[PDB]
Structure formats: C-alpha cells, structure tokens
Structure 1
Amino acid sequence: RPDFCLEPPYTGPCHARIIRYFYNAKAGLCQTFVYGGCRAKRNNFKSAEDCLRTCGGA
C-alpha cells in the first residue's frame, strides 16, 4: 500500500470542522478525524470505503 497511508491525519490550517477518514495502521482500520478544509494530505478520504480500498492492510 502507499506510504501516505502510514501518515497521521492532517487537519491543516483552515478553520472548518469537516469529517474525513484516515487509515490508522496501528489499528488496521479507517477512522474519522476533523479536517480543516484546505491542504489535505493523501490519507484523507470522504468515505470509509474509499479509505479501505486505498489503504486497507497498510
């Protein structure tokens, strides 16, 4: 799987409170986190399904 899947979630500098998903390699599942709205990293998905399809098993 892509290495970006191993990066911690990144909220960014914008002040929004947008629910997004990131892959947590420690637990082996995609978890939710709050995204600020701008400058998202790659381990940031709009659905748990997209996240698992991209990072599952990393």
Structure 2
Amino acid sequence: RPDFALEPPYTGPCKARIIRYFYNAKAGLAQTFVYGGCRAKRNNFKSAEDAMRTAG
C-alpha cells in the first residue's frame, strides 16, 4: 500500500472540529480523527468506504 496510508493522522493548524477518516497501519482498520479544517494530508477521507477503496 502507498506511503500516506502508514502516516499518522494530521489534525493541522486550523481549529474546527471536523470528523474525518484515516487508515491505521497498527490496527489495520479505518478509524476516525479530529481534523482542524485546513492543510489536509492524503490520509484524510470524507467517508469510510472511500478510505477502504484507496487504502485497503
């Protein structure tokens, strides 16, 4: 799988509380995290099925 899938979830500098999905390399499952609202990295998805398609 690509390099971004193994990278830790990035909240970013912004201060909003937006629930986004990422892929955990340790657990091997798609979990949720708090995204700040700006400067997203690639391991940041809007839906659970969009995370499973690209990363799984």
TM-score, normalising length: structure 2: 0.96
Unaligned runs of 5+ in 1: none
Q: Percent identity?
A: 89
Unaligned runs of 5+ in 2: none
- Indicate the RMSD between aligned Cα atoms, in angstroms: 0.5
CA distance in 2, matches of 1:54, 1:3: 12
Runs of 4+ in 1 over 6 A off after TM superposition: none
What is residue 25 of structure 1 aligned with on the other side? 25
Equivalenced residues, count: 56
